[PDB]
Protein backbone atom coordinates (compact mmCIF):
# COMPACT_ATOMS: atom_id res chain seq x y z
CA UNK A 1 0.00 0.00 0.00
CA UNK A 2 3.06 2.29 0.37
CA UNK A 3 5.20 1.12 -2.66
CA UNK A 4 2.45 1.04 -5.34
CA UNK A 5 2.61 -2.42 -6.96
CA UNK A 6 -0.01 -3.35 -9.67
CA UNK A 7 -0.12 -7.11 -8.97
CA UNK A 8 -0.82 -6.56 -5.24
CA UNK A 9 -3.70 -4.12 -5.73
CA UNK A 10 -5.11 -6.37 -8.52
CA UNK A 11 -5.35 -9.79 -6.73
CA UNK A 12 -5.39 -8.91 -3.02
CA UNK A 13 -6.22 -5.35 -1.68
CA UNK A 14 -8.73 -4.31 -4.33
CA UNK A 15 -10.83 -7.55 -4.28
CA UNK A 16 -10.96 -6.93 -0.45
CA UNK A 17 -12.13 -3.29 -0.63
CA UNK A 18 -14.83 -4.85 -2.89
CA UNK A 19 -15.48 -7.83 -0.63
CA UNK A 20 -15.93 -5.52 2.38
CA UNK A 21 -17.86 -2.44 1.16
CA UNK A 22 -20.77 -1.73 -1.13
CA UNK A 23 -19.65 0.08 -4.39
CA UNK A 24 -20.86 3.49 -3.22
CA UNK A 25 -19.09 3.65 0.14
CA UNK A 26 -16.02 2.36 -1.64
CA UNK A 27 -16.15 5.28 -4.05
CA UNK A 28 -16.54 7.71 -1.17
CA UNK A 29 -13.55 6.29 0.67
CA UNK A 30 -11.57 6.49 -2.53
CA UNK A 31 -12.52 10.14 -2.90
CA UNK A 32 -11.54 10.79 0.73
CA UNK A 33 -8.21 8.91 0.43
CA UNK A 34 -7.47 10.67 -2.83
CA UNK A 35 -8.25 14.20 -1.61
CA UNK A 36 -6.05 13.61 1.44
CA UNK A 37 -3.32 12.42 -0.92
CA UNK A 38 -2.74 9.21 1.01
CA UNK A 39 -1.77 7.45 -2.18
CA UNK A 40 1.82 6.55 -3.31
CA UNK A 41 3.56 9.26 -5.41
CA UNK A 42 3.68 7.40 -8.76
CA UNK A 43 6.99 5.61 -9.49
CA UNK A 44 6.74 6.32 -13.28
CA UNK A 45 8.36 9.51 -14.89
CA UNK A 46 6.39 10.80 -17.92
CA UNK A 47 8.61 10.71 -21.08
CA UNK A 48 8.44 13.51 -23.70
CA UNK A 49 6.75 10.99 -25.99
CA UNK A 50 3.48 11.28 -24.13
CA UNK A 51 3.24 15.04 -24.39
CA UNK A 52 0.29 16.27 -26.46
CA UNK A 53 -0.52 19.88 -27.33
CA UNK A 54 -4.28 20.03 -27.91
CA UNK A 55 -7.14 22.42 -27.11
CA UNK A 56 -4.74 25.38 -26.53
CA UNK A 57 -2.77 23.35 -23.95
CA UNK A 58 0.11 21.01 -23.45
CA UNK A 59 -0.81 17.71 -21.85
CA UNK A 60 2.01 15.96 -20.04
CA UNK A 61 0.59 12.43 -20.69
CA UNK A 62 -2.71 11.78 -22.52
CA UNK A 63 -4.37 9.64 -19.80
CA UNK A 64 -7.20 11.49 -18.00
CA UNK A 65 -9.33 10.62 -15.00
CA UNK A 66 -12.83 10.62 -16.39
CA UNK A 67 -15.93 12.51 -15.27
CA UNK A 68 -17.72 10.65 -12.50
CA UNK A 69 -14.92 9.84 -10.13
CA UNK A 70 -14.53 13.37 -8.86
CA UNK A 71 -18.05 14.67 -9.17
CA UNK A 72 -17.59 17.73 -6.96
CA UNK A 73 -13.93 18.63 -7.35
CA UNK A 74 -12.73 17.45 -3.95
CA UNK A 75 -9.77 15.40 -5.09
CA UNK A 76 -8.27 17.18 -8.08
CA UNK A 77 -4.79 17.54 -6.61
CA UNK A 78 -4.53 13.85 -5.55
CA UNK A 79 -5.62 12.74 -8.99
CA UNK A 80 -2.69 14.54 -10.50
CA UNK A 81 -0.51 13.04 -7.77
CA UNK A 82 -1.83 9.68 -8.97
CA UNK A 83 -0.25 10.29 -12.38
CA UNK A 84 -3.13 11.39 -14.60
CA UNK A 85 -2.07 13.88 -17.25
CA UNK A 86 -5.33 15.84 -16.87
CA UNK A 87 -8.29 15.93 -14.56
CA UNK A 88 -11.96 16.24 -15.32
CA UNK A 89 -14.48 16.92 -12.58
CA UNK A 90 -17.75 15.03 -12.57
CA UNK A 91 -20.99 16.36 -13.91
CA UNK A 92 -21.96 19.39 -11.90
CA UNK A 93 -25.60 20.61 -12.00
CA UNK A 94 -26.58 24.24 -11.41
CA UNK A 95 -28.41 23.72 -8.04
CA UNK A 96 -27.47 20.88 -5.64
CA UNK A 97 -29.50 17.72 -6.08
CA UNK A 98 -29.23 14.29 -4.51
CA UNK A 99 -29.51 11.84 -7.37
CA UNK A 100 -31.56 8.63 -7.70
CA UNK A 101 -32.46 6.36 -4.81
CA UNK A 102 -29.77 3.96 -3.54
CA UNK A 103 -28.78 1.42 -4.59
CA UNK A 104 -27.51 3.04 -7.79
CA UNK A 105 -24.05 1.48 -8.51
CA UNK A 106 -23.16 -2.14 -9.19
CA UNK A 107 -20.12 -4.17 -9.97
CA UNK A 108 -20.00 -6.88 -12.55
CA UNK A 109 -16.65 -8.31 -11.53
CA UNK A 110 -16.92 -11.10 -14.18
CA UNK A 111 -17.38 -8.53 -16.93
CA UNK A 112 -14.97 -5.98 -15.44
CA UNK A 113 -17.82 -3.60 -15.85
CA UNK A 114 -19.92 -1.28 -13.74
CA UNK A 115 -23.50 -0.11 -14.01
CA UNK A 116 -24.46 3.17 -12.41
CA UNK A 117 -27.67 5.16 -12.27
CA UNK A 118 -26.58 8.00 -9.95
CA UNK A 119 -28.40 10.53 -12.06
CA UNK A 120 -26.23 13.60 -11.36
CA UNK A 121 -25.78 13.72 -7.63
CA UNK A 122 -24.21 17.17 -7.25
CA UNK A 123 -23.14 19.69 -4.69
CA UNK A 124 -23.94 22.14 -7.48
CA UNK A 125 -22.29 25.17 -8.99
CA UNK A 126 -21.75 27.37 -5.87
CA UNK A 127 -20.04 24.68 -3.88
CA UNK A 128 -17.79 23.49 -6.71
CA UNK A 129 -17.03 27.08 -7.68
CA UNK A 130 -15.68 27.85 -4.16
CA UNK A 131 -13.83 24.60 -4.19
CA UNK A 132 -12.06 25.34 -7.51
CA UNK A 133 -11.60 29.03 -6.68
CA UNK A 134 -9.61 27.99 -3.62
CA UNK A 135 -6.84 26.47 -5.74
CA UNK A 136 -7.41 28.62 -8.81
CA UNK A 137 -3.76 29.75 -9.11
CA UNK A 138 -2.32 26.41 -8.20
CA UNK A 139 -4.36 25.23 -11.17
CA UNK A 140 -3.02 28.05 -13.32
CA UNK A 141 0.52 26.81 -12.52
CA UNK A 142 -0.44 23.22 -13.12
CA UNK A 143 -1.93 23.89 -16.51
CA UNK A 144 1.26 25.61 -17.57
CA UNK A 145 3.01 22.47 -16.47
CA UNK A 146 0.91 20.28 -18.75
CA UNK A 147 -1.78 19.31 -16.21
CA UNK A 148 -5.00 20.94 -17.47
CA UNK A 149 -8.40 20.79 -15.66
CA UNK A 150 -11.73 20.10 -17.35
CA UNK A 151 -15.17 20.82 -15.96
CA UNK A 152 -18.13 18.68 -16.92
CA UNK A 153 -21.58 20.32 -16.85
CA UNK A 154 -24.95 18.59 -16.54
CA UNK A 155 -28.54 19.79 -15.86
CA UNK A 156 -30.98 19.69 -12.93
CA UNK A 157 -33.65 16.98 -12.77
CA UNK A 158 -36.45 19.56 -12.37
CA UNK A 159 -34.95 22.18 -14.74
CA UNK A 160 -37.58 23.38 -17.26
CA UNK A 161 -34.94 24.90 -19.62
CA UNK A 162 -31.96 22.63 -20.52
CA UNK A 163 -30.03 25.22 -22.45
CA UNK A 164 -30.22 27.67 -19.57
CA UNK A 165 -28.72 25.23 -17.05
CA UNK A 166 -25.65 24.62 -19.13
CA UNK A 167 -25.54 28.35 -19.65
CA UNK A 168 -25.16 28.73 -15.91
CA UNK A 169 -22.30 26.26 -15.86
CA UNK A 170 -20.36 28.08 -18.45
CA UNK A 171 -20.80 31.26 -16.55
CA UNK A 172 -19.96 29.96 -13.13
CA UNK A 173 -17.29 27.41 -13.91
CA UNK A 174 -16.06 28.27 -17.39
CA UNK A 175 -13.67 30.80 -15.85
CA UNK A 176 -12.05 28.11 -13.68
CA UNK A 177 -11.50 25.56 -16.45
CA UNK A 178 -9.17 24.82 -19.30
CA UNK A 179 -11.98 23.01 -21.11
CA UNK A 180 -15.62 22.66 -20.33
CA UNK A 181 -17.85 19.62 -21.12
CA UNK A 182 -21.46 19.78 -22.22
CA UNK A 183 -22.57 16.40 -20.99
CA UNK A 184 -25.64 15.47 -22.98
CA UNK A 185 -24.96 11.75 -22.90
CA UNK A 186 -25.87 10.54 -19.45
CA UNK A 187 -28.21 7.61 -19.52
CA UNK A 188 -29.70 8.39 -16.18
CA UNK A 189 -31.60 11.69 -16.47
CA UNK A 190 -35.06 11.49 -18.20
CA UNK A 191 -34.83 12.97 -21.73
CA UNK A 192 -31.17 14.16 -21.54
CA UNK A 193 -29.85 12.05 -24.38
CA UNK A 194 -32.49 13.48 -26.80
CA UNK A 195 -30.45 16.76 -26.59
CA UNK A 196 -28.14 14.82 -28.91
CA UNK A 197 -30.69 15.53 -31.69
CA UNK A 198 -29.49 17.88 -34.44
CA UNK A 199 -31.90 20.81 -33.99
CA UNK A 200 -31.98 20.57 -30.21
CA UNK A 201 -28.16 20.25 -29.98
CA UNK A 202 -27.49 23.23 -32.31
CA UNK A 203 -29.72 25.52 -30.30
CA UNK A 204 -28.20 24.34 -27.03
CA UNK A 205 -24.63 24.67 -28.21
CA UNK A 206 -25.14 28.02 -29.88
CA UNK A 207 -26.06 29.35 -26.45
CA UNK A 208 -23.21 27.58 -24.71
CA UNK A 209 -20.74 28.91 -27.27
CA UNK A 210 -22.13 32.36 -26.90
CA UNK A 211 -21.80 32.48 -23.16
CA UNK A 212 -18.24 31.08 -23.36
CA UNK A 213 -17.28 33.84 -25.83
CA UNK A 214 -18.44 36.51 -23.37
CA UNK A 215 -15.86 35.37 -20.82
CA UNK A 216 -12.52 37.19 -20.69
CA UNK A 217 -9.62 35.77 -22.82
CA UNK A 218 -7.67 34.22 -19.95
CA UNK A 219 -10.80 32.53 -18.51
CA UNK A 220 -12.24 31.43 -21.85
CA UNK A 221 -12.18 27.60 -21.94
CA UNK A 222 -12.59 25.06 -24.68
CA UNK A 223 -16.03 23.54 -25.10
CA UNK A 224 -16.62 19.90 -25.96
CA UNK A 225 -19.64 17.66 -26.19
CA UNK A 226 -19.62 14.24 -24.47
CA UNK A 227 -21.81 11.91 -26.55
CA UNK A 228 -23.34 8.44 -25.96
CA UNK A 229 -22.05 5.09 -27.51
CA UNK A 230 -25.59 4.17 -28.35
CA UNK A 231 -26.09 6.73 -31.15
CA UNK A 232 -27.66 5.82 -34.53
CA UNK A 233 -25.61 6.75 -37.59
CA UNK A 234 -28.01 9.58 -38.43
CA UNK A 235 -27.27 10.89 -34.96
CA UNK A 236 -23.49 10.78 -35.52
CA UNK A 237 -23.66 12.42 -38.93
CA UNK A 238 -25.66 15.22 -37.29
CA UNK A 239 -23.59 15.66 -34.20
CA UNK A 240 -20.66 15.75 -36.55
CA UNK A 241 -22.22 18.32 -38.83
CA UNK A 242 -23.40 20.68 -36.12
CA UNK A 243 -19.93 20.44 -34.58
CA UNK A 244 -18.17 21.58 -37.69
CA UNK A 245 -20.76 24.30 -38.23
CA UNK A 246 -20.62 26.00 -34.83
CA UNK A 247 -16.92 25.36 -34.46
CA UNK A 248 -17.13 23.27 -31.24
CA UNK A 249 -13.65 22.57 -29.93
CA UNK A 250 -13.97 18.88 -29.27
CA UNK A 251 -15.77 15.72 -28.40
CA UNK A 252 -15.48 13.34 -25.54
CA UNK A 253 -16.25 9.98 -26.95
CA UNK A 254 -18.67 7.92 -25.08
CA UNK A 255 -20.44 8.07 -21.93
CA UNK A 256 -21.61 4.71 -20.58
CA UNK A 257 -24.05 2.57 -22.57
CA UNK A 258 -27.61 1.52 -22.09
CA UNK A 259 -26.96 -1.48 -24.33
CA UNK A 260 -26.17 -4.84 -22.70
CA UNK A 261 -23.83 -6.89 -24.85
CA UNK A 262 -24.51 -10.58 -25.33
CA UNK A 263 -22.04 -12.21 -22.97
CA UNK A 264 -22.36 -10.18 -19.71
CA UNK A 265 -21.82 -12.73 -16.89
CA UNK A 266 -22.43 -10.25 -14.01
CA UNK A 267 -25.25 -11.27 -11.74
CA UNK A 268 -26.36 -7.60 -11.90
CA UNK A 269 -26.32 -7.18 -15.73
CA UNK A 270 -30.02 -6.40 -15.94
CA UNK A 271 -29.84 -3.38 -13.65
CA UNK A 272 -31.04 -0.08 -15.13
CA UNK A 273 -28.28 2.41 -15.80
CA UNK A 274 -25.13 3.16 -17.67
CA UNK A 275 -22.81 0.31 -18.42
CA UNK A 276 -19.06 1.02 -18.18
CA UNK A 277 -15.82 -0.97 -18.14
CA UNK A 278 -14.62 -3.62 -20.54
CA UNK A 279 -17.96 -4.41 -22.32
CA UNK A 280 -17.93 -0.76 -23.46
CA UNK A 281 -14.40 -0.64 -24.89
CA UNK A 282 -14.70 -1.60 -28.51
CA UNK A 283 -18.13 -0.01 -28.84
CA UNK A 284 -16.49 3.14 -27.50
CA UNK A 285 -13.43 2.88 -29.81
CA UNK A 286 -15.68 2.35 -32.85
CA UNK A 287 -17.46 5.61 -31.98
CA UNK A 288 -14.19 7.46 -31.81
CA UNK A 289 -13.52 6.05 -35.28
CA UNK A 290 -16.87 7.12 -36.85
CA UNK A 291 -16.50 10.63 -35.28
CA UNK A 292 -12.91 11.19 -36.26
CA UNK A 293 -13.71 10.24 -39.83
CA UNK A 294 -16.92 12.34 -39.93
CA UNK A 295 -15.13 15.43 -38.64
CA UNK A 296 -12.09 14.57 -40.81
CA UNK A 297 -9.44 14.64 -38.08
CA UNK A 298 -10.01 18.36 -37.48
CA UNK A 299 -11.93 17.95 -34.26
CA UNK A 300 -10.04 16.76 -31.18
CA UNK A 301 -11.44 13.71 -29.46
CA UNK A 302 -11.02 12.56 -25.89
CA UNK A 303 -11.47 8.79 -25.96
CA UNK A 304 -13.02 7.15 -22.94
CA UNK A 305 -14.64 3.77 -22.37
CA UNK A 306 -13.07 0.55 -21.06
CA UNK A 307 -9.42 1.76 -21.16
CA UNK A 308 -7.34 -0.38 -18.72
CA UNK A 309 -4.03 -1.01 -20.62
CA UNK A 310 -1.57 0.71 -22.99
CA UNK A 311 -3.10 -1.29 -25.87
CA UNK A 312 -6.57 -0.14 -24.83
CA UNK A 313 -5.18 3.39 -24.77
CA UNK A 314 -3.18 3.21 -27.99
CA UNK A 315 -6.10 1.63 -29.77
CA UNK A 316 -8.34 4.65 -29.24
CA UNK A 317 -5.53 7.03 -30.25
CA UNK A 318 -4.92 5.08 -33.48
CA UNK A 319 -8.68 5.27 -33.80
CA UNK A 320 -8.31 9.05 -33.55
CA UNK A 321 -8.44 10.07 -29.93
CA UNK A 322 -6.02 12.80 -28.98
CA UNK A 323 -6.57 12.03 -25.30
CA UNK A 324 -8.00 9.15 -23.38
CA UNK A 325 -9.64 8.96 -20.03
CA UNK A 326 -10.30 5.89 -17.93
CA UNK A 327 -12.49 5.40 -14.87
CA UNK A 328 -13.79 1.92 -14.20
CA UNK A 329 -10.37 0.32 -14.61
CA UNK A 330 -9.67 2.11 -11.34
CA UNK A 331 -12.25 0.14 -9.39
CA UNK A 332 -10.55 -3.15 -10.46
CA UNK A 333 -6.78 -2.60 -10.56
CA UNK A 334 -6.56 0.47 -8.35
CA UNK A 335 -4.11 3.44 -8.67
CA UNK A 336 -1.27 1.37 -10.21
CA UNK A 337 -3.33 1.07 -13.43
CA UNK A 338 -2.53 4.70 -14.23
CA UNK A 339 1.18 3.73 -14.11
CA UNK A 340 0.44 0.63 -16.28
CA UNK A 341 -1.39 2.32 -19.12
CA UNK A 342 1.24 5.02 -19.28
CA UNK A 343 4.05 2.52 -19.39
CA UNK A 344 2.39 0.04 -21.75
CA UNK A 345 1.26 2.94 -23.92
CA UNK A 346 4.87 4.06 -24.02
CA UNK A 347 6.31 0.63 -24.93
CA UNK A 348 3.81 0.14 -27.72
CA UNK A 349 4.48 3.53 -29.36
CA UNK A 350 8.15 2.52 -29.68
CA UNK A 351 7.40 -1.03 -30.75
CA UNK A 352 5.30 0.33 -33.64
CA UNK A 353 7.75 2.98 -34.84
CA UNK A 354 5.90 6.00 -33.52
CA UNK A 355 7.82 9.11 -32.31
CA UNK A 356 5.13 10.03 -29.77
CA UNK A 357 1.42 10.05 -29.09
CA UNK A 358 1.08 12.95 -31.54
CA UNK A 359 2.14 10.81 -34.53
CA UNK A 360 -0.26 8.02 -33.62
CA UNK A 361 -3.48 10.07 -33.46
CA UNK A 362 -5.72 8.84 -36.32
CA UNK A 363 -2.92 6.55 -37.42
CA UNK A 364 -5.47 3.93 -38.51
CA UNK A 365 -7.21 6.31 -40.93
CA UNK A 366 -3.97 6.64 -42.95
CA UNK A 367 -2.71 3.07 -42.90
Ligand SMILES: Cc1cc2nc3c(=O)[nH]c(=O)nc-3n(C[C@H](O)[C@H](O)[C@H](O)COP(=O)(O)O)c2cc1C
Pocket residue numbers: 066067068069071090091105114116118120152183226254255256275276277278280304305306307325326327328329
Ligand atom coordinates in the same frame (compact mmCIF):
# COMPACT_ATOMS: atom_id res chain seq x y z
C1 LIG B 1 -19.87 5.46 -11.33
C2 LIG B 1 -19.82 6.21 -12.64
C3 LIG B 1 -20.23 7.54 -12.62
C4 LIG B 1 -20.08 8.33 -13.75
N1 LIG B 1 -20.46 9.66 -13.75
C5 LIG B 1 -20.32 10.47 -14.87
C6 LIG B 1 -20.72 11.82 -14.90
O1 LIG B 1 -21.05 12.46 -13.90
N2 LIG B 1 -20.56 12.57 -16.01
C7 LIG B 1 -20.00 12.02 -17.12
O2 LIG B 1 -19.85 12.73 -18.13
N3 LIG B 1 -19.60 10.70 -17.10
C8 LIG B 1 -19.76 9.91 -16.00
N4 LIG B 1 -19.35 8.59 -16.02
C9 LIG B 1 -18.96 7.93 -17.29
C10 LIG B 1 -17.47 7.97 -17.44
O3 LIG B 1 -17.21 9.34 -17.54
C11 LIG B 1 -17.02 7.27 -18.72
O4 LIG B 1 -17.57 7.95 -19.85
C12 LIG B 1 -17.37 5.77 -18.84
O5 LIG B 1 -17.34 5.09 -17.62
C13 LIG B 1 -16.40 5.02 -19.74
O6 LIG B 1 -15.12 4.96 -19.14
P1 LIG B 1 -14.68 3.78 -18.17
O7 LIG B 1 -15.21 2.45 -18.60
O8 LIG B 1 -13.16 3.76 -18.08
O9 LIG B 1 -15.20 4.10 -16.81
C14 LIG B 1 -19.52 7.78 -14.90
C15 LIG B 1 -19.11 6.45 -14.93
C16 LIG B 1 -19.26 5.65 -13.81
C17 LIG B 1 -18.37 4.45 -13.76
Ligand SMILES: O=C(O)c1cc(=O)[nH]c(=O)[nH]1
Pocket residue numbers: 068091116117118119120121183185186187188255256274
Ligand atom coordinates in the same frame (compact mmCIF):
# COMPACT_ATOMS: atom_id res chain seq x y z
O1 LIG C 1 -24.23 10.58 -12.60
C1 LIG C 1 -24.78 9.75 -13.37
O2 LIG C 1 -25.82 9.09 -13.11
C2 LIG C 1 -24.10 9.54 -14.66
C3 LIG C 1 -23.89 10.59 -15.50
C4 LIG C 1 -23.21 10.35 -16.66
O3 LIG C 1 -22.97 11.26 -17.44
N1 LIG C 1 -22.80 9.13 -16.96
C5 LIG C 1 -23.02 8.12 -16.11
O4 LIG C 1 -22.64 6.97 -16.40
N2 LIG C 1 -23.66 8.33 -14.96
